[PDB]
Amino acid sequence: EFDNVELKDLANVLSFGEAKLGDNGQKFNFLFHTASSNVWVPSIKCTSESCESKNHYDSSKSKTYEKDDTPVKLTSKAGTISGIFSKDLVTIGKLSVPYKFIEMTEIVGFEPFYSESDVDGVFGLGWKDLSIGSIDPYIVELKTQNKIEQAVYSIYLPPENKNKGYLTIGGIEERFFDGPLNYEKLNHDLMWQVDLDVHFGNVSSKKANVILDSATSVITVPTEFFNQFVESASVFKVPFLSLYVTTCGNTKLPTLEYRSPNKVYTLEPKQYLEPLENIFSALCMLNIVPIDLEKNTFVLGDPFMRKYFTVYDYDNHTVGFALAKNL
Amino acid sequence: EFDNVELKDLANVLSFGEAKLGDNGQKFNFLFHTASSNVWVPSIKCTSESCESKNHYDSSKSKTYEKDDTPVKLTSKAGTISGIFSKDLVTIGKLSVPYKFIEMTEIVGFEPFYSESDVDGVFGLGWKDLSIGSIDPYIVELKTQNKIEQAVYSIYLPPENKNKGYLTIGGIEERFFDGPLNYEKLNHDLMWQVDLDVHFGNVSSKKANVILDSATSVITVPTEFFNQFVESASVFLSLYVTTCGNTKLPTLEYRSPNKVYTLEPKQYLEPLENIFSALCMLNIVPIDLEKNTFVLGDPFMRKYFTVYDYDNHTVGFALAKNL
Amino acid sequence: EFDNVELKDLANVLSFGEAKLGDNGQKFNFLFHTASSNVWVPSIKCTSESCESKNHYDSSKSKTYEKDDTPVKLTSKAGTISGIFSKDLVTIGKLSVPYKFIEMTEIVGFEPFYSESDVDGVFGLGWKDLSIGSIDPYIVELKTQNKIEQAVYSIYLPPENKNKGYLTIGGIEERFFDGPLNYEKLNHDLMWQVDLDVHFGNVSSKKANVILDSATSVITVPTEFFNQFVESASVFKVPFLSLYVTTCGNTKLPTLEYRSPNKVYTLEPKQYLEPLENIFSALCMLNIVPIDLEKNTFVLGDPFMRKYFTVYDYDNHTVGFALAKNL
Amino acid sequence: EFDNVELKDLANVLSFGEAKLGDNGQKFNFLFHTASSNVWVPSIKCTSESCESKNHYDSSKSKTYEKDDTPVKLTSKAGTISGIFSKDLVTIGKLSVPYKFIEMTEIVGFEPFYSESDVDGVFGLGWKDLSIGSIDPYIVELKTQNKIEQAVYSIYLPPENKNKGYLTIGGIEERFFDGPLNYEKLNHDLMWQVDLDVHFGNVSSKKANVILDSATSVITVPTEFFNQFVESASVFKVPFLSLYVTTCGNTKLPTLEYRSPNKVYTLEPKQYLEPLENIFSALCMLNIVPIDLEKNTFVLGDPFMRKYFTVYDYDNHTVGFALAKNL
Numbered sequence A, C, D: 001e002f003d004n005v006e007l008k009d010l011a012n013v014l015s016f017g018e019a020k021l022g023d024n025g026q027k028f029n030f031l032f033h034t035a036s037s038n039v040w041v042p043s044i045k046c047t048s049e050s051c052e053s054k055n056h057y058d059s060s061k062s063k064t065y066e067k068d069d070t071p072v073k074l075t076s077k078a079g080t081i082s083g084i085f086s087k088d089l090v091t092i093g094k095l096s097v098p099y100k101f102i103e104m105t106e107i108v109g110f111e112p113f114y115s116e117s118d119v120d121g122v123f124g125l126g127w128k129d130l131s132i133g134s135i136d137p138y139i140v141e142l143k144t145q146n147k148i149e150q151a152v153y154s155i156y157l158p159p160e161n162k163n164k165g166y167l168t169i170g171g172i173e174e175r176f177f178d179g180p181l182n183y184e185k186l187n188h189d190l191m192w193q194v195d196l197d198v199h200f201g202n203v204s205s206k207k208a209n210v211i212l213d214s215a216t217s218v219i220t221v222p223t224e225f226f227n228q229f230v231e232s233a234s235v236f237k238v239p240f241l242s243l244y245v246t247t248c249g250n251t252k253l254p255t256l257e258y259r260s261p262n263k264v265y266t267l268e269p270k271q272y273l274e275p276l277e278n279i280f281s282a283l284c285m286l287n288i289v290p291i292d293l294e295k296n297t298f299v300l301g302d303p304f305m306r307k308y309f310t311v312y313d314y315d316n317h318t319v320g321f322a323l324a325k326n327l
Numbered sequence B: 001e002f003d004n005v006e007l008k009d010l011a012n013v014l015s016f017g018e019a020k021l022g023d024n025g026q027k028f029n030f031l032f033h034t035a036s037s038n039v040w041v042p043s044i045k046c047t048s049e050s051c052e053s054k055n056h057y058d059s060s061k062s063k064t065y066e067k068d069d070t071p072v073k074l075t076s077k078a079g080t081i082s083g084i085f086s087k088d089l090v091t092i093g094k095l096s097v098p099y100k101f102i103e104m105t106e107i108v109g110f111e112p113f114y115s116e117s118d119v120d121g122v123f124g125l126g127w128k129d130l131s132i133g134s135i136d137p138y139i140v141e142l143k144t145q146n147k148i149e150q151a152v153y154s155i156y157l158p159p160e161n162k163n164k165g166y167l168t169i170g171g172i173e174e175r176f177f178d179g180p181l182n183y184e185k186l187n188h189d190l191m192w193q194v195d196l197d198v199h200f201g202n203v204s205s206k207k208a209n210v211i212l213d214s215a216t217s218v219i220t221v222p223t224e225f226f227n228q229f230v231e232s233a234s235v236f237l238s239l240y241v242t243t244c245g246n247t248k249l250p251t252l253e254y255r256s257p258n259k260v261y262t263l264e265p266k267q268y269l270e271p272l273e274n275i276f277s278a279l280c281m282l283n284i285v286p287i288d289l290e291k292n293t294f295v296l297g298d299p300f301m302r303k304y305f306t307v308y309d310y311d312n313h314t315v316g317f318a319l320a321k322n323l
């Protein structure tokens, strides 16, 4: 034997948390996904190696389980996922309602990321029309059964990792934010998406389609938008050392802004940069990625959510934004 | 109030662990750093807003404190840290020896990233020639003081998470790896750096300087090497984003005279979504550090258990194993 | 005699510092004034009581004094100032040039404030076309005379009073701020004044004339603008205990924004509020005053300069703004 | 670098000075607070960001410290302060006594104002009945322990500035005032509070509760009284350009009167008006704030203490007023 000291991971919070299935309280780790509208879970029957060291849902150990069995198969350019539909108790903290979910039974093609993390499944929190089987979103379902009064939830991510991070259902906790809470109207009942004029230095795109996505740890922007910025950065002498790398202290890096008619949401340069080293880092990389998802569409991930406490209001069809606060 | 639920971090082990100072065991979160040669720690005396949230070293609370007070200051085109040398018991695990560290007294230029991490300081595991003050590396000092027989350590990151990570001092645990341990000679005692021929598709860089650096979570390549790969791609611009589980991409090869070390697309690709991600990005970053220099961080150390041998001036590599 | 403890000031750095007249270094406490265009200094000849406690300029002591004697008289419902123009060495720090200033000869009114305070006079840092006598600005004259090579200055107020403020001449000092430093063009060369769209919750004013004024400790808004705000605050039920008093933590107060084509400058509620009590104050007041100065005109005083480091550039006719930082 | 001149604060003296705790003389800037009844100090053990730049009490450095550890928590609509009671030597000037004080371990809800000021804590000078934990006032304690013979203090603020302010303990220094010293009896031994008839123009409130509060720089008036005054000065054609703003030379403004059975205390426009600009200001605001604290309650802060040297006499349960002189 020799001297071994335990290594740790870094304090880094996202919309990762525990929910429960069945009346025997079967525990899982969920990614609470604002841009998906089903709950998906590793089934006890899953024949896929992926599934081995996960948490499982066993419909025979829960006395409140209901047969549905409607098969479903989803496939990406990247991977494939097939399962069956089940109903049972679904619980987050104190609240519980019977809900229609997908038991995963074959998972091909998401490696080594899927088996590498301690996440079991997705607990979608998007809108009805984006979901398979056309199901009412979980939180609406809580309101239907009068378990809560207002179809609303909120994500607080701790803006400096000094404390726990939280998902709150049924009401707005003022402990989480400073300044005003501001609602924007949804441009569609598909995702949590809003019309905003986006500005990044001299580049701008009016009335862009902008989407909240608690699953990405990136900011996203169209290719052409990203090209215009690269060229404009060049015009404005913003120094870069390669496409994505810059001095963290770079004084020419512009504020990224999303403007509505009555409120501007912003990420300062150091709020969209990732350090190259994990301590005392002189260099930085833009955490902004050109991807073309839809005409004029931009995605807000964790970097936005790290700064903005966000609110999701089914009843009003709005998204609330406020400056996240250290607990 | 209303129904809460706790949200937590995604388990992601790196070379970050605890170490103690003084005979009253002042505890710190350190980045165990293969590319720094001093131990740096926040002083109780630090006047910076950076130092506020952190653990501090307070010499007055330690009977084994030996006064030094030799001033240090590092300044950088943008960055400043400064402090004083002090001598006290430094403890990792069950191992303990008097050692000269730097109590940082001013920390400027590394916000907000510093205060948002729970790292307090750096525990250098590099070589003497880059130590400010020419101080023997901590592990060498353990050996001089007969705390250990061999001035060797190793770093194990769990290759598939689901498992805990380790820094081991003084010998080699077979439990951590599979297949043989291959050793490479250092090209120069400056850092843990080896001569290797690097290849990526049609592009190659002979007799490159490659540095192990436990403090980046990235793989680094010179700008010219990356431009060459872009040019060679021209035969058929992003190329930065691709499909996850795209196997039609080159493998990164680092060739020594008797072993080739590799990182396949699934070692160098990072997903854009944090579950079931359709798209992925290259975790290969072009940046010029020094002539012909490449750096190997985390994504390499996740595949390769690495051994750092001071007695023999070598680095050992082997395939990291579960448990 | 009894036990006495001294009482002091609350740390509150404004654009107030020292400068010198004549080759014998006569010193004065000046308000460095971005919205005025002459230097005004009390004369040794001043006959008023207000002048008794002040520093005085005595031309008979300076071998570099050049006689002008053109009389000036400014007379406004709060007081009247008369004086004569004189020319002499005028010195800020290391820098020095012959300049024309007004020695005040009579100061009627402005009481008790002028004599209660320890400012001697005003050091105008505005544009020529606002100057009495149409005198080139001091900073211009420095460049005209080859003392500096860029006719630019900056004002830094400590954003939390943890260090000294600084007036810098001749170039940009990055220690004061976190990038980006964004430049806006002047709408006119009368004052430091820019076209910006102002938003305060749902109220807005397009293409407003906004003016930097280092001499007020207040934010200014036209009367109508303020009335629109009151209107929508009443409708939306933002809690006010009276016309300016609110809880410091009021979550319904909006952010004040000033939008250029490429950048938004903002004041969060607690950056435009002042506390009722000087410690642990539950209650606050709006430091926003409705005043009709000019069509559609808004003035930025101390609350703004306290958050934004500001650069005043005569060569390029622009003002720069950046997030001020602690030293 | 570049030519730089320092910027300073103005001289504005308030009820704010130094006192020491413990035998090693740990110094703090305290607000000498006539409407608080404990002493509050940040603890070295405080875990809030609020405490970070402040002076701290470290009990283990003082050989005279005695453990108490009684918890205290004060919370409200938007403020939490908690801590523990500790006993040590407490020193103002050459005077020293063992005294129970509160070590703050958490200060939340008072940013950014708390960190922007160089006040560390509050040194209560009120009455026992308002003390948390039922503690004898510091100055009474000085009397009990035979360190002074009269339990009395005074606050002198220099009426025209340049001049230090002074807190005096143990007797009356005639040097601070002109004219008689008039005394008013307390309507209650809770605060330094007095029955007075308050008149402002045509508006009056008889047998008002008027409270001395050395912690506001404002004068306070119930909302109905204020409303009646503004409607009233409308009827009588006062020049107002908005709701608090008038010219600094406004001749027509009434004197504010506080009438007791044998003395009338007054505040003229001179004493209740704050200028919009910090030098040669044409425009002014009423420093009088409408705010309902309790039935018929009016607060006198700085503007009043600036004119009147005030004396606080525990022995005879009275407050004394005299016109303050220049030193």
Ligand SMILES: CSC[C@H](NC(=O)Cc1ccccc1)C(=O)N[C@@H](Cc1ccccc1)[C@H](O)C(=O)N1CSC(C)(C)[C@H]1C(=O)N[C@H]1c2ccccc2C[C@H]1O
Residues within 6 Å of the ligand: A276, A277, A279, A280, A281, A282, A283, B035, B036, B037, B040, B074, B122, B130, B211, B213, B288, B289, B290, B295
């Ligand atoms: C290759 S990322 C290495 C990083 N260097 C940079 O960012 C250099 C840089 C800066 C700007 C433009 C281009 C290049 C760096 O110097 N990091 C340092 C982090 C640090 C840790 C503790 C106290 C202060 C800083 C370094 O790991 C260290 O301990 N040191 C201690 S001394 C130092 C400040 C010169 C640096 C060093 O040896 N740097 C060298 C190094 C290290 C790892 C890999 C390559 C190189 C070359 C040179 O950059």
Ligand SMILES: CSC[C@H](NC(=O)Cc1ccccc1)C(=O)N[C@@H](Cc1ccccc1)[C@H](O)C(=O)N1CSC(C)(C)[C@H]1C(=O)N[C@H]1c2ccccc2C[C@H]1O
Residues within 6 Å of the ligand: C035, C036, C037, C040, C074, C076, C077, C081, C122, C130, C211, C213, C215, C216, C293, C294, C299, D247, D276, D277, D279, D280, D281, D282, D283
């Ligand atoms: C932000 S409020 C500006 C203030 N005027 C007022 O409040 C409006 C007013 C005017 C006349 C009677 C009553 C009310 C004012 O003019 N203050 C002045 C302070 C002063 C400094 C030195 C000697 C005497 C006064 C001014 O900043 C200046 O130097 N001047 C020099 S001469 C002046 C008295 C006409 C004035 C001016 O150019 N004012 C301009 C100004 C300033 C700030 C904001 C808008 C404007 C427009 C313009 O009127």
Ligand SMILES: CSC[C@H](NC(=O)Cc1ccccc1)C(=O)N[C@@H](Cc1ccccc1)[C@H](O)C(=O)N1CSC(C)(C)[C@H]1C(=O)N[C@H]1c2ccccc2C[C@H]1O
Residues within 6 Å of the ligand: C247, C277, C279, C280, C281, C282, C283, D035, D036, D037, D040, D074, D076, D077, D081, D122, D130, D211, D213, D216, D293, D299
């Ligand atoms: C000029 S307003 C006085 C102020 N009250 C307010 O703002 C009223 C308020 C409260 C909550 C929501 C909305 C409005 C206040 O209580 N300030 C306090 C400042 C303080 C100082 C140290 C530690 C914490 C706060 C006070 O002077 C004190 O020490 N205390 C100590 S305990 C207390 C919270 C009961 C309060 C008190 O005695 N208040 C009394 C007071 C003080 C001044 C004027 C009137 C009154 C009545 C009574 O409420």
Ligand code: NA
Residues within 6 Å of the ligand: A259, C197, C259
């Ligand atoms: Na806009």
